Amino acid sequence: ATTYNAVVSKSSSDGKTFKTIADAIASAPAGSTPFVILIKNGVYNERLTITRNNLHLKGESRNGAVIAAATAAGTLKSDGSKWGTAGSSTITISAKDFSAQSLTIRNDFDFPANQAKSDSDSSKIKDTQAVALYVTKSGDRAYFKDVSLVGYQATLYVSGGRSFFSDCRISGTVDFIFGDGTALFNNCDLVSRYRADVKSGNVSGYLTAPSTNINQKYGLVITNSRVIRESDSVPAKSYGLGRPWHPTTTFSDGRYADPNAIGQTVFLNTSMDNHIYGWDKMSGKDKNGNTIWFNPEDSRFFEYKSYGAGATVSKDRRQLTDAQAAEYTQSKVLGDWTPTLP
Numbered sequence: 001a002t003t004y005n006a007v008v009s010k011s012s013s014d015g016k017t018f019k020t021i022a023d024a025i026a027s028a029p030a031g032s033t034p035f036v037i038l039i040k041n042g043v044y045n046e047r048l049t050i051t052r053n054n055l056h057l058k059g060e061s062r063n064g065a066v067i068a069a070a071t072a073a074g075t076l077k078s079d080g081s082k083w084g085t086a087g088s089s090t091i092t093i094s095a096k097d098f099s100a101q102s103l104t105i106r107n108d109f110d111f112p113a114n115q116a117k118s119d120s121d122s123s124k125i126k127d128t129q130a131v132a133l134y135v136t137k138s139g140d141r142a143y144f145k146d147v148s149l150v151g152y153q154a155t156l157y158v159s160g161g162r163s164f165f166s167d168c169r170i171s172g173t174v175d176f177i178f179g180d181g182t183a184l185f186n187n188c189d190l191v192s193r194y195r196a197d198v199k200s201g202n203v204s205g206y207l208t209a210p211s212t213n214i215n216q217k218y219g220l221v222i223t224n225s226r227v228i229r230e231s232d233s234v235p236a237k238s239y240g241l242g243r244p245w246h247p248t249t250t251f252s253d254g255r256y257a258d259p260n261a262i263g264q265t266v267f268l269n270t271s272m273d274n275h276i277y278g279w280d281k282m283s284g285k286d287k288n289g290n291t292i293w294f295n296p297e298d299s300r301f302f303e304y305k306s307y308g309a310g311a312t313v314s315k316d317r318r319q320l321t322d323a324q325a326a327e328y329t330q331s332k333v334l335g336d337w338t339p340t341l342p
């Protein structure tokens with residue numbers, strides 16, 4: 001039994017369908033009864049914010065149903081202010097029990113074209129993060145199955161509660177999965193992208209930048225997945241598995257890198273190509289305005305039974321025991337929530 005509350009399509013010959021996704025979402029009665037929207041094949045140039053609980057999107061196919069918009073953090077609004085990282089997102093989830101299935105979500109900000117611009121070009125953006133998908137502090141129980149997420153810097157922003165990504169593709173360069181949420185990935189392709197702007201010998205990017213609060217049990221957990229290069233031009237040892245993001249945060253004694261954001265990234269049973277060199281450090285500003293470095297050895301960065309050419313075991317790459325690995329099942333990570341589609 002599968003039935004839709006609204007249908008979106010590019011055709012008028014399709015019949016009684018909405019022309020935009022935003023229109024179909026807005027049409028949902030107020031409340032928290034399930035609302036299921038079918039999205040037919042096409043590229044929908046839209047930015048969406050989801051505030052209704054129990055909303056569900058289903059694309060006709062991952063290959064053909066695309067929601068896309070180009071916005072960087074350094075892109076300017078009408079009032080001349082920057083959008084910022086959170087504000088750059090193509091899709092923002094600020095509701096509970098959201099699901100998306102069989103669709104692609106992109107931030108189309110052309111990072112390589114931006115980097116190729118001359119340094120004196122006033123249109124060259126420095127704040128190059130450009131989020132495809134953002135799950136906010138208000139999001140919990142967000143389920144993404146057979147979804148593709150496309151960007152370069154800062155593709156996926158996972159904050160708030162629990163999110164589950166299954167049979168997914170996520171592509172990016174720098175910190176392309178980041179934030180303080182509980183985010184479980186199973187059977188996903190994590191695609192590290194080529195950077196034309198990076199000198200031979202320098203780092204191209206980092207898969208994760210977790211900012212998990214030290215008192216939160218689970219951050220970014222990646223299971224049964226594949227960590228792959230976009231192309232043969234992505235150099236060996238060009239990508240880190242993670243670096244520790246301590247976000248600038250307003251405290252009673254000022255605004256500075258959160259010392260208690262000691263992020264967790266755990267890889268279990270995951271293949272890795274040789275573009276991976278291991279973990280890395282990251283800097284912030286301290287309470288005095290000085291540069292402070294946060295080291296991977298002080299973070300919750302672990303692996304369990306990685307394989308492929310990028311899976312080396314050393315003192316700089318801590319490994320879980322069998323008993324420790326048993327703490328990272330779906331049941332333990334997601335707790336009482338069983339992700340289900342309508």
Ligand SMILES: COC(=O)[C@H]1O[C@H](O[C@@H]2[C@H](O)[C@@H](O)[C@@H](O[C@@H]3[C@H](O)[C@@H](O)[C@@H](O[C@@H]4[C@H](O)[C@@H](O)[C@@H](O[C@@H]5[C@H](O)[C@@H](O)[C@@H](O)O[C@@H]5C(=O)O)O[C@@H]4C(=O)OC)O[C@@H]3C(=O)OC)O[C@@H]2C(=O)OC)[C@H](O)[C@@H](O)[C@H]1O[C@H]1O[C@H](C(=O)O)[C@H](O)[C@H](O)[C@H]1O
Binds near residue numbers: 084178205206247284
């Ligand atoms: C989600 O989090 C983020 O997206 C993240 O974004 C920002 O990160 C910065 C930057 O965008 C990112 O690309 C990365 O950059 C590093 C490095 O930090 C940067 O200086 C640059 O370095 C290279 C090279 O890697 C290095 O070895 C060296 O090289 C030599 C020499 O020094 C140099 O001058 C040149 O001649 O080359 C020499 C050589 O060896 O050949 O320097 C070069 C260089 O170009 O320097 C000028 O590129 C690096 C890189 O590309 O790595 C893949 O990280 C940056 C960073 O961490 O800066 C502190 C942002 O800065 C981060 O804070 C983070 O942003 C989030 O958090 C913010 C916060 O305040 O908490 C905000 O909230 C923000 O909105 C949010 O997104």
